[PDB]
Design a protein around this ligand. Structure first.
Ligand SMILES: [Cl-]
Ligand SMILES: [Cl-]
Ligand SMILES: [Cl-]
Lengths: 69, 70
């Protein structure tokens, strides 16, 4: 996956939601430093942490699979 | 809201269907074998970059459902 796909994904939909990164962190119940790191392109974020951020922004994850058709 | 064991069965099913052992999938993804064991047991503390290396070996890509635009 592109290195800044999720970075811009979180930033765009957070700015479009009017949330600061402190408000998005408080809503997701995660650390403030996590929002900074994600939007900077860092991918060492734990997934249960990332999903708590995505749900506040109403973004869900689909896995496209090689089979079946 | 993604359920707590979606990733565990996703990695397990497609690793079993690919004929790869836990250690075989770990060496391809460049991660520890215990990491593969922990993912399939359900723990979601797996790191994002760690997950992406496992998914890319299994030819699984992440797509995002966004609320806008239509
Ligand atoms: Cl900004
Ligand atoms: Cl999701
Ligand atoms: Cl599944």
């Amino acid at each position: 996956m592109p290195k800044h796909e999720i970075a811009n994904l979180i930033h765009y939909y957070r700015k479009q939601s009017g949330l600061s990164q402190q408000e998005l962190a408080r809503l997701a119940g995660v650390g403030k430093t996590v929002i900074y790191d994600i939007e900077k392109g860092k991918e060492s974020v734990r997934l249960n942490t990332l999903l708590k951020v995505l749900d506040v922004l109403n973004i869900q994850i689909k896995f496209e699979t090689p089979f079946p058709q």
